[PDB]
Amino acid sequence: YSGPKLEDGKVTISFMKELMQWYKDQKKLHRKCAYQILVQVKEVLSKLSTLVETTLKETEKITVCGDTHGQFYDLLNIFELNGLPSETNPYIFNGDFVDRGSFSVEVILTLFGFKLLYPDHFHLLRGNHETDNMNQIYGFEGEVKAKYTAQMYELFSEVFEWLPLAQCINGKVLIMHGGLFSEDGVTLDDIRKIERNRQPPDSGPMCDLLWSDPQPQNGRSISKRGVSCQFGPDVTKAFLEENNLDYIIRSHEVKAEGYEVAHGGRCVTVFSAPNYCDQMGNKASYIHLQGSDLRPQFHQFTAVPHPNVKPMAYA
Ligand SMILES: O=C(O)[C@@H]1[C@H](C(=O)O)[C@H]2CC[C@@H]1O2
Ligand SMILES: [Mn+2]
Ligand SMILES: [Mn+2]
Secondary structure (H helix, E strand, O other), X not given: OOOOOOEOXXXXXXXXHHHXXXXXXXXXXXXHHHHHHHHHHHHHHHOOOOEEEEOOOOOOEEEEEOOOOOOHHXXXXXXHHHOOOEOOEXXXXXXXXXXXXXXXXXXXXXXXXXXXXXXXXXXXXXXXXXXXXXXXXXXXXXXHHHHOOHHHHHHHHHHHOOOOOEEEEOOOEEEEOOOOOOXXXXXXHHHHHOOOOOOOOOOOHHHHHHHOEEOOOOOEEEOOOOOOEEEOHHHHHHHHHHOOOOEXXXXXXXXXXXXXXXXHHOEEEEXXXXXXXXXXXXXXEEEEEEOXXXXXXXXXXXXXOOOOOOOOOOO
């Protein structure tokens, strides 16, 4: 084995650079290194609140990315366009890092490594695909079994249970994978109090955070996905007012331009998997926020070449 090795058992920036090149070249991180990253990141994540609260000073910025779905070569493109993560270049990846795309192992271990390297500046929120029943079906479990073992997959599954469910910036912008709730009256403190270290239930706030979608008309509708709901602009307005928020940022739906701004400004979708499944032909985007101006700034990007492995090859 001549691949990347941790230094004194820890991630360093040189390790991360070596890992990204190793993965670009389609090689595998040694299982002992992968294991170390997973046990360390489980410990880091298990200390976090279900609601991560982040303050951006006036001169600070943060980048918000939506789903990435194992599109590792597109993830590298994000870092090339926008800079590597660092204490002065923070990131939030808003769930759905795995499944569908066939470089899910590379995406997730790269993201976990950066979480370890910059724990206060690199943030990962859970998506509906960071769950066992979805991974069983949509590629990630197959991919982990092919590259490592069933035991490694069980460890991933346990780490995913500790991913936080939402993040609030400056008490003003709330970020979650799916959306808002099937019932009125949910507060930020209710979100803080969710015991999240589990597979999601099929109803309730934890389910909604990972699964809901906005709809244009007022009200709520039964979701076409079979779980959670669609929520209208009235739902969003009431939630923002009770919680003294400005708007939400969510992901969870593919958008041809990489983003959408619904509910009159109040519900933003960002989606960071361009040409999803090598077929959708969509652009992707990421958002910049700044402590002096929390309004979203959108940066669009398009897909880059990857090795010839088909999406869902492991599903
Ligand atoms: O997040 C989702 O549920 C959607 C799909 C999925 O994750 O299964 C994929 C395409 C649009 C969104 O990302
Ligand atoms: Mn998705
Ligand atoms: Mn999703």
